Amino acid sequence: GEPKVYAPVTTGADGKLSLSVGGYKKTFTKVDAATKAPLAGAVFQVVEKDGDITLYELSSPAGYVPVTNKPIYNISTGEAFDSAAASVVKEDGQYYITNTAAL
Amino acid sequence: PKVYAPVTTGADGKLSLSVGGYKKTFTKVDAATKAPLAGAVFQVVEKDGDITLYELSSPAGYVPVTNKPIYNISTGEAFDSAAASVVKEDGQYYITNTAALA
Amino acid sequence: EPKVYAPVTTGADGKLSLSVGGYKKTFTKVDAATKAPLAGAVFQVVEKDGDITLYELSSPAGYVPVTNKPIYNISTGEAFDSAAASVVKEDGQYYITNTAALAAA
C-alpha cells in the first residue's frame, strides 16, 4: 500500500529513544542486559505499513549480538510488542530495549 | 524535484521505473536463492533530469538498506549508474537483498 | 608473510587511498542523498588466506554507525552482497554511499 518510512534513527550516549509518531508517544532506553548501562549506536526506524505502526532495530550497538532489521515493538497496538524476541522489558515504570553483549 | 510515492514489493517483487519516457524493470530477489522477496520499500526521485531508484527499507530478516540509490537513469550523456545489488542474468535485472547472518 | 596494510581516513574529498600492490583502486565516500563527499570514514584493507578484502572500521560523523564491515573483495573485484547496496559505480569510479542518521531522544 502506502507505507511512510521514517528516517533512520540512532540512539545517543543516553540510550534514549523518543518515539512520537501519530497519536502515540513513548520513550525507550537501550541498555546492556547484564550491566543496564545505556547504549549508543542502535539504528531504529518506523514505517507506517497500512494501519500498523512497527518499530524495527536495523542494527544493534557495537560489540553486541547483531539484531538485523527485526521488529521489536508495535506502536499502533499499544504495549502489544511483536514478541518475536522479548527484548523489551518494563522496570520501575520505565521501558528498556535490551541488547546482549557479544563475546 | 517532483513528487513520487513509496511502493512495496509483493510476492512477485516486480519494480517498474516508468518515469517520463525512460523505463526499466527490476525484480527484488534474494542474494543467495534468487527468490522473489516481499516487504522492501522503494521510492523514485527526479533531480536535474536524473531518475533515481532508492531503497527505503529492506525486507525484515535481511540486511538493512536505508535510503540507498540502487539504480539511476541519466537522461544526458552519462550512463545509467547502479549499485552493486543490481545483477543482470537471463536478460533481466535483479535487486538483491542479503539475508541475516542468523 | 601476511602483509599488514595501514588504514586510511577519508578527507574532505571523500576519496579512499587504496594502493594494494598493483591492484590500486579508487573509492569515494559520499552521502547517499546529497551525493556530497564525506570525511572521517575509517577504512582498512586486510588479507587472510589469500583473500584481499576492504573493511570499513568507522562511518563518518552523523551517519549510520559501522564497525568492521566488509565492503569490497579486492581479489575478486566484487563487492560483498551485505554491503552491495552501498557500492555504486557511476562514471567509471566507485562510490560508497552513507545514509544520515538522526538523533533518537
Side-chain angles (χ1 to χ4, degrees), chain A:
Chain A
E2 308 106 305
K4 184 183 183 304
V5 188
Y6 284 82
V9 167
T10 177
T11 59
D14 55 356
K16 301 300 182 60
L17 173 59
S18 300
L19 297 177
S20 296
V21 179
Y24 318 93
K25 183 177 181 179
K26 188 172 180 175
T27 58
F28 294 92
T29 302
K30 265 247 63 210
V31 292
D32 185 9
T35 65
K36 301 182 182 181
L39 260 49
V43 186
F44 295 96
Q45 73 172 8
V46 177
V47 63
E48 299 191 342
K49 288 177 177 177
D50 298 334
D52 294 334
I53 308 302
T54 50
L55 168 72
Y56 305 87
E57 179 174 338
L58 303 181
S59 301
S60 68
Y64 286 74
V65 178
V67 180
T68 69
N69 205 340
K70 303 176 185 177
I72 306 300
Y73 186 79
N74 194 322
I75 302 181
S76 61
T77 67
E79 296 179 348
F81 55 100
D82 293 71
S83 67
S87 59
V88 187
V89 66
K90 181 182 179 181
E91 174 175 322
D92 301 329
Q94 316 301 326
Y95 300 98
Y96 304 92
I97 300 182
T98 301
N99 305 273
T100 304
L103 46 83

Side-chain angles (χ1 to χ4, degrees), chain C residues 1 5-6 8 15 19 24 31 39-40 43 45 52 63-65 80 94 101:
Chain C
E1 85 297 332
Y5 306 91
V8 298
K15 309 167 75 69
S19 56
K24 310 206 171 197
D31 189 308
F43 291 84
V45 45
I52 315 293
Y63 290 82
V64 174
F80 297 107
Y94 293 80

